[PDB]
Design a protein around this nucleic acid. Sequence first.
RNA 1: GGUGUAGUGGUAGGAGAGCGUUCUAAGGGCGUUGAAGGUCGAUCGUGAGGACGGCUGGAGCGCUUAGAAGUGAGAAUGCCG
RNA 2: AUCCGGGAGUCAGACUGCGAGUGAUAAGAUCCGUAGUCGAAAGGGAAACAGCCCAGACCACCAGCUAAGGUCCCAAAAUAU
RNA 3: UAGUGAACCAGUACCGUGAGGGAAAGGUGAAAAGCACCCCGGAAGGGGAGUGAAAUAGAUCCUGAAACCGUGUGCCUACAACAAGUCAAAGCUCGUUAAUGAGUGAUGGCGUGCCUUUUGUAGAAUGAACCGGCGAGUUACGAUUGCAUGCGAGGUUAAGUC
Lengths: 112, 116, 144, 102, 48
Amino acid sequence: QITSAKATAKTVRTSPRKARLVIDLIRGKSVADAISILKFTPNKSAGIIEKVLMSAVANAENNFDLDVESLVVSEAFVNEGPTMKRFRPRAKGSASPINKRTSHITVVVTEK
Amino acid sequence: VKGGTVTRKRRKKVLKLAKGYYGSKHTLFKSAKEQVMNSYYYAFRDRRQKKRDFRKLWIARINAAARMNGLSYSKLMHGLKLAEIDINRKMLADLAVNDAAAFTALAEQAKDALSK
Amino acid sequence: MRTTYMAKAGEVERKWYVVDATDVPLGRLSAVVASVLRGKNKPTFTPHVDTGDFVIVINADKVKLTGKKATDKIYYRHSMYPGGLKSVTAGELRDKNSRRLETSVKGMLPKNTLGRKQFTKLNVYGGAEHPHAAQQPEVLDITN
Amino acid sequence: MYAIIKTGGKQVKVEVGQAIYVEKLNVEAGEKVVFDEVILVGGESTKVGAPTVAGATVEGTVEKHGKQKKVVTFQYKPKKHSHRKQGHRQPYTKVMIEAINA
Amino acid sequence: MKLHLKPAEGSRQVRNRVGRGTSSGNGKTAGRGQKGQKARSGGGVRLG
RNA sequence: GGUGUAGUGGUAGGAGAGCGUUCUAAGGGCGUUGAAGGUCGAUCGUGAGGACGGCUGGAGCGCUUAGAAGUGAGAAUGCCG
RNA sequence: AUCCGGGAGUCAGACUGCGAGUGAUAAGAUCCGUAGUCGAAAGGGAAACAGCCCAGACCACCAGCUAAGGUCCCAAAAUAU
RNA sequence: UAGUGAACCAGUACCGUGAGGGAAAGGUGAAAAGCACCCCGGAAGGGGAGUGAAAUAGAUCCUGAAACCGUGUGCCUACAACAAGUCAAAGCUCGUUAAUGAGUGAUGGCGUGCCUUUUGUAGAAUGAACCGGCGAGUUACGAUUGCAUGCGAGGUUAAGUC
């Protein structure tokens, strides 16, 4: 048999450093604690990893498993995606570039 | 003629002589070639200071174990070269550590020679 | 690669010695004591392993200073602040802190991390009595 | 047993049933070698000799002919233009030991 | 003697390519040394 | 071709012999039972460099003799990404 | 060593010992003769040090003898007579 | 990044009132058979199920290096002055193109990067943020010398015709 369903979300418009903070608060914790943690952090990268955990839990339910109450978040990644590029007029004629970055967020949910 | 796969064979043969270097290295092809060169300087030097160092080590151990028998740190040399005994100082170091009986035998013959 | 004893950290047995200081000058006490604490006069060197011994020094109040130097060897300290030399000491330290006169052997050793380990095997007592009698020390004569 | 034996320019300790790493000998694999110069003989009652103790021959047999690893020796001199590149790899002979002095 | 050939001995030299690295003997200023108008591009005075 | 004696630091520079890239010709070869390229390896030669094996990869490429060159990169307050 | 040809670099040199000049018989000054080292020279000594004393590396080894300079402890060798 | 500046709707987009200047951008598979249907989600995006020899070939679609950014772990690190190496080396882990093995490294000796220009550099003279690609003694006509080849008191064609 198998365990550990996956779920990803590609090219999400958040900076990748500011989403590596929230994923440090989940690694190794059960699924019961993690949703409760993510509901009470007022960051933008809270309301995304919520949806990634809920989709991973739903994959594990409605494809393979039972025992929603015995699942543990064992791995979580943030990888960098394709950056947009724009400009901005600085003073005295010149200009300066501006990155606009994207991240790839994955969550793996083993049993225990 | 393009320059396809000629540079990379060089640069990766350089990097594989440069595994285990403190920092950037590993991954910089300009600053990993340099410490390979300086490592070759230190290899040239240090193949020729192995031989200096162990003379000093075995001399210090011969001095200690010779002073254990009352002989000074040098009169073993003069005493053995009058008695026509020509051991390397490596083997005198090993005998002076292990064979206390044989080292006292050699020390007594060196006492016997210069007792004229 | 061949055979010489690179001794290990837990093979060397150490001892405890007693060295008097009644009317011997500083240089020669410190010379013999500093040659002891590196593990010399034993055939089992490494230049790594602490093959030294333990030295206890008795009667530090009665150490000779030959000729002059009684009022003359001005030590010096500076304390990293402006106008901060303190030449407070002299040959006064024979009377007050005769333990401290732990400088003329701390100079004699290397300044590695073995010259900090091997310095902590001196126990210099100004009086004439151990507190360390439970470890059975021995005596060294000095005709050196 | 001890036999401090001059071989080549060097001196080695010798026991029975061991291997030595010796410079070349011009003897083929699996033949007999008799080392002649013996400085000290050990065991219990050591026999110190003014050089080459008389009546002391050390036998022995040769396993292989093989080499050390390479010794890369590159020289350069800074801010000028130089490259000397070499490589060196000496051969050596193992020696099994039989019958320290008969 | 057929298609798969030998020249005469000494019949054909190779070349000498100049400015290709400091161990052939002609890298870094190409057999011209330091500065001066024999070492610029197209320099050198007229004949005589 | 055993064996003697002697020699072997080096900038500008002079001289000699080799390594490697792409193409042409002739001969002999490999390849859907896996070619070129990429990655890893504790391998060989005095040098530049050459093999062998494991993974990836999906249509071409080596070897020998001679020839012809857009034939080798670490620096230009180099140019492009 | 000379002669006949093919091919170059170099025309800013330094300091030290010894003769002189200008200078104030001042300078790591300047300008000449004369020898060495550096330039184009790595190794040992003078604490560290291009030019000073000793000495010129084809390469390997956990062998041996000496130079200049040294031998109470950092640091190898006499607490020498 | 070659070859026309232009392999693609290029003298176009864009820049200057104007004369003028002027780019980047090729590749799924044989066949679109380009993922019906179910689940999470507002959607994007994903996990099954299928098409397919292969989907880690899913449209930014052959292969996919380097700088750069992450995850997990075998070894080490909180009295220590370190051009960051090399030489010596205890312990701990591992098992190769089989051999005088591989990783890591408590601790000790020694040790002022790379170029260019200079009588002299570690220089506080002068250059490089890093990685990748491109990027410099050639050809025609003459002259002279060495080597080789065929003739040799002789040698040899040119323009031009088939």
